Amino acid sequence: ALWQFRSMIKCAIPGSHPLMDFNNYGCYCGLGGSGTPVDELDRCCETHDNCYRDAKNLDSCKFLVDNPYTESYSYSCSNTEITCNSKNNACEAFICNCDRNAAICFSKAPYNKEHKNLDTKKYC
Ligand SMILES: [Ca+2]
Ligand SMILES: [Ca+2]
């Protein structure tokens, strides 16, 4: 679920404010997305939107209000490493992995200030 994704980010990058840092960053990070991502970070964001798209398309997953962000799963954090619990259902595990791959991905992408609060209408 959304709050658990903010929290996995905080797991992978301990000195971060997720909403402050990665929301309205680039082409993608925020709501929807458009164009080509501006850098590796924005790309991480794009892959995550795609990862959620795929999930919405498993016939066997029907999310509350159609939003995978409402879906709680089980995971834990340990010395920087995120684990998705194996006992998540197939739907819960898919979301858990999207969030997981996006947190790690974030943690490795360079952070370019010029790209936070981008004029998307113009560059996206
Ligand atoms: Ca997005
Ligand atoms: Ca659940």
Domain boundaries, the chain: 1-124
Distance from the alpha carbon of residue 27 to the mean position of ligand 1, in angstroms: 8
Distance from the alpha carbon of residue 101 to the mean position of ligand 2, in angstroms: 19
Which amino acid, one-letter code, is at 85?
N
Q: How far apart are CA 35 and CA 117, in angstroms?
A: 15
Say if residue 30 carries a ligand binding annotation.
yes
Task: Give the chain's length.
Answer: 124
CATH superfamily, with its number, for domain 1-124: Phospholipase A2 domain (1.20.90.10)
Q: Are 121 and 31 in contact (CB under 8 A)?
A: no
As a three-state string, the secondary structure of the chain is CHHHHHHHHHHHCCCCCHHHHHCCECCCECCCCCCCCCCHHHHHHHHHHHHHHHHHCCCCCCCHHHCHHHCCCCEEEECCEEEECCCCCHHHHHHHHHHHHHHHHHHHCCCCHHHECCCHHHHC
User: Which ligand does the CA of 87 lie closest to?
Assistant: 2
Distance from the alpha carbon of residue 71 to the mean position of ligand 2, in angstroms: 5
Q: How far apart are CA 72 and CA 40, in angstroms?
A: 27
